[PDB]
Amino acid sequence: MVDINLFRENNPEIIRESQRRRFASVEIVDEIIKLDKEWRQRQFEVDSFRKEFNKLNKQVAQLSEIIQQTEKNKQDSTAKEAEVREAYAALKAKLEQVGNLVHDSVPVDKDEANNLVIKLWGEKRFSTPGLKLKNHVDLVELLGIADTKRGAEIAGARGFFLKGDGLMLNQALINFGLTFLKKRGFTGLQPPFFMRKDVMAKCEELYKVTGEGDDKYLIATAEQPLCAYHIDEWIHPTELPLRYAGYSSCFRKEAGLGIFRVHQFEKIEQFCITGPNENASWEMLDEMMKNSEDFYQALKLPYQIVSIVSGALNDAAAKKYDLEAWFPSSETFRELVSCSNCTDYQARRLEIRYQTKQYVHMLNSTLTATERTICCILENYQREDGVDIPEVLQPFMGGETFLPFK
Amino acid sequence: MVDINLFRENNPEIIRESQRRRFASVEIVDEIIKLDKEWRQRQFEVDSFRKEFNKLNKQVAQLSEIIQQTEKNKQDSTAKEAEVREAYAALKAKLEQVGNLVHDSVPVDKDEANNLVIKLWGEKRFSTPGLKLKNHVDLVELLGIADTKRGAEIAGARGFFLKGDGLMLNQALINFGLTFLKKRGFTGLQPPFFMRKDVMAKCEELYKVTGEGDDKYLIATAEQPLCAYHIDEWIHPTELPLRYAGYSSCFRKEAGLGIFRVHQFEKIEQFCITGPNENASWEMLDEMMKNSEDFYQALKLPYQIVSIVSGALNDAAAKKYDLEAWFPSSETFRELVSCSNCTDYQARRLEIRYQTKQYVHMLNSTLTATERTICCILENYQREDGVDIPEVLQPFMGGETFLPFK
């Protein structure tokens, strides 16, 4: 949630302007201003009873009916705390729905057709006139590195096995990503692949897991457990910035026969926590964006950075970039990376603390969804008779250079 | 299931002797002999109606009431097929419960106290008189390579993160195991980490996953999906033997604060399919057992091979060995590997085929449950000030030799 102080004392015109930019409710800001003021007034009058009480208890100099005022007082107050219960619950219901303050540099439009292209990199391959550069779907079958039929019979729709060199490629990319980030100051973390309902609730298009205790949800992304990692804690300025390289399998109900659009996949994730103060998070977002650029440059996959339009931003994100990579057979760019500064949105929900009441800023950024990355590698590196192996990944398959059809 | 022909024509004394050895029902063999004979007699009399029918249809030389015999006949027969339905269903209910034929060499006892130690390897460390060699539980905390507290708050009981060098160690072992088996003739396969209810049913102390379609179960082991991989198929003699190196995350409800006894862990699995004929599966079990011995020898972890007592064998397994490794702080051996020849038990259930009605033999054998292996490594390689890295694994962390407390 955003800071409720942003609605007190154009203090709230900044929340409104942000709501306009999201193409979302602007009247809710007024709903929140009433509900904050009533929550505030009920808290004040509970303070007033604790003040009338002590100023009644220290009225005993009389040396009868004041003790009756004290009887009533303590019954009048004990009711108003459950009105503070009811006011705050109403406030949080609405406050929750407000998106994070959209940063000034974000292109203000409603549809991702108008995402601002900010950077191109790499020379692209195009299908010559005779016959198509093959698509990742045909490449996978030709190379024999997934079993999509069998995985579908075993796991239902969109299920697959990795087989032979698909599994070495997948591990190749994971290990290259993990050492890549380790070099650049990151500490690895593999989370549990499921979370307690009540913890996922603060970080139902996730799979549900029953049960040893609590019903649990399968994580859609390592972002979710690393988010919760550090819940309720303080973090000392001296600890920050924190850089974690998240690694997990991921599970998505919405996978809208190949290996790009699937229910289960592996992901390496950058996740960083900074202090809130001197554009540290904004500096960190550029650092995370450079780390991702370098990795696809290292893989020699062409791409474009787009900045995401304000009406397409999720609630947590003040600002977001995608790196969409070139896919030769369709001659289209496709998302391989998203990179968001969520500032204190999640940190205020999770009580991740930093005279002044401060919170940490949190960011996240895909390095690689490995199955997708592989689809992109396959298309880009294909030949008449098979697919070359990206040179950075050759050591991590010590040291094959080529996977052959058929 | 076992071959039903084993109960027809001491043909069934071999099933009985096997039932005795399992310390399991010997009267069920007689239950199955009645139920097989009645299933057989109902199938025969449906053949008899199809034989009385055609010998009635080819009685038309008359040139009235024979066509009435044909009316009745075809109503008498169509009832007896649903008696073949009811006889076979009764037969399968009981047949299912019979364990696989226990091989003659299996030690016939009821309790694993009496598992036959068949081989020792490696020189063992023992705690000297002053103070304990530390246990994997303390080592993990001291080295900072798991977060068991936090994982527990996020994922419930026994949840953990891998952190820093725990994650490199885990990936180190996975990649060493995968290249290890690749060298020895194996093709990798990473399965989906969940299976359709109805497919798991032929391969409820598994977690349940709801839902995109079918309710699914999380796999306890890569053995389960690789089992189903090849369901209903034929396999040509020329394809065999097949050697798959299974890799998956594993999920167990029964995890009876450290990383040994957990709900989620990674496993590398050998899984082999042979033809049934010339002691190929038995030769394969020794090959799989050598592959596992060499891997712990390569890791220089001391161990013992036990052969598992007949009353402790699971239903599928005709014979089973464990490699239990030395754990220095408790001065006890603990299971890191199980290695079973299941012959045609699962193959007959799954219709995995090979004049004569034959089935393939299937085997499986842990190479490494990586979290356990790590616990064993930590205890064995510990020093005053940290833990050494097994030399085989040093390249796969290119090339640190030591992880320090604290």
Domains belonging to chain A, first-starting first, are 1-99 (no CATH), 100-406 (3.30.930.10)
Separation in Å, CA of A203 to nearest CA in chain B: 11
Q: Do B164 and A187 touch (CB under 8 A)?
A: yes
User: What kind and span of H or E run contains A116?
Assistant: strand A116-121
Contact A12, A46 (CB under 8 A): no
In the numeric block, the tokens 């940490």 are attached to: A360
What whole-number distance in Å separates Cα of residue B179 and Cα of residue B296? 15
Which residue on chain B is closest to A395 by alpha carbon?
B396
Helix (H) or strand (E) holding A54: helix A28-57
Determine if residue A134 is labeled as part of a ligand binding site: no
Partners of residue B264 in chain A, C-beta under 8 Å: 192-194
Which strand (E) or helix (H) includes residue A338? strand A332-341
Residue with tokens 């790590």: B374
Contact with chain A for residue B394, Cβ under 8 A: no
The reply to whether A117 touches chain B by the CB within 8 Å rule is no
B382 contact partners, CB below 8 Å, separation of at least 6: B133, B134, B139, B328, B388
> CA torsion angle for B153, B154, B158, B161 (degrees, to 10)?
-110
Q: Does B18 belong to an annotated binding site?
A: no
Measure the CA–CA gap between B249 and B266, rounded to whole angstroms. 4
Rounded to whole angstroms, the Cα distance separating B229 from B246 reads 11
Q: CA A55, CA B116: separation in Å to the nearest integer?
A: 83
Give start and end residues of each alpha helix (H) in B144-277: 148-155, 165-183, 197-200, 223-228
Radius of gyration of chain B from Cα atoms? 27
Residue A231 contacts B, CB cutoff 8 Å: yes
| Cβ-based neighbour number of residue A382 at 10 Å | 24
Q: Look up residue A109 and give its two tokens.
A: 């439009």
Backbone angles phi, psi at A287, to 5 degrees: -55, -45
The b-or-e profile of A198-228 (16+ CB within 10 A means b, else e) is: ebbeebeebbbbeebebebbbbbbbbbbbbb
B216 to chain A, any CB pair closer than 8 A? The answer is: yes
Query: For residue B14, what is the DSSP state?
Result: H
Both tokens of B298, joined, read: 């390569």
Question: Count of CB atoms within 10 A of residue A297's CB?
Answer: 15
b/e per residue, B359-388, with b = 16+ CB within 10 A? Answer: bbbbbbbbbbbbbbbbbbbbbbbbeeebbb
Question: Do B240 and B278 touch, CB atoms closer than 8 A?
Answer: no
Which whole-number Å values give the CA distances from A352 to A95, A236, A239, A283, in the listed order? 18, 11, 13, 20
Q: E strands within B152-282?
A: 161-163, 187-190, 194-196, 208-210, 216-218, 242-251, 264-274
Q: After which residues is chain B broken (C to N over 2.5 A)?
A: 9, 63, 203, 256, 354
Give the CA diameter of chain B: 109
The tokens 């369901």 sit on which residue? B231
CB A373 within 8 A of CB A177: no
- Sign for the CA dihedral angle at A349, A181, A186, B263 comes to positive
Rounded distance between C-alpha atoms, residue A370 and residue A336, angstroms: 9
Exposed / middle / buried, residue A364 (Cβ in 10 Å: 0-12, 13-18, 19+): buried
Strands A361-369 and A187-190: unpaired
Q: How many CB atoms lie within 10 A of CB A310?
A: 23
Give yes or no for A199 touching B (CB within 8 A).
yes
Name residue B245's amino acid.
Answer: A
For A379, half-sphere exposure in the C-beta direction (CA atoms, 13 angstrom radius) is 30
Helix boundaries (H) for A112-164: 136-143, 148-155
Taking alpha carbons only, the member of B296, B305, B292, B290 closest to residue B117 is B305
3-state class of B324 per DSSP?
strand
Question: What residues pair up with A388 in beta bridges, in sequence order?
Answer: A402
Angle at A16 between CA A14 and CA A21, to 5 degrees: 95
Instruction: Give A 253-292 residues with CB within 8 A of chain B.
Output: 253, 263-264
Residue B323, judged by CB atoms within 10 A of its CB (0-12, 13-18, 19+), counts as buried
**Cβ atoms A209, A237 nearer than 8 A:** no
Whats the size of chain B, residue-wise? 406
What is the Cα–Cα distance from A270 to A363, expressed in whole angstroms?
8
How far, in Å, CA of B177 to CA of B169, rounded?
Answer: 12
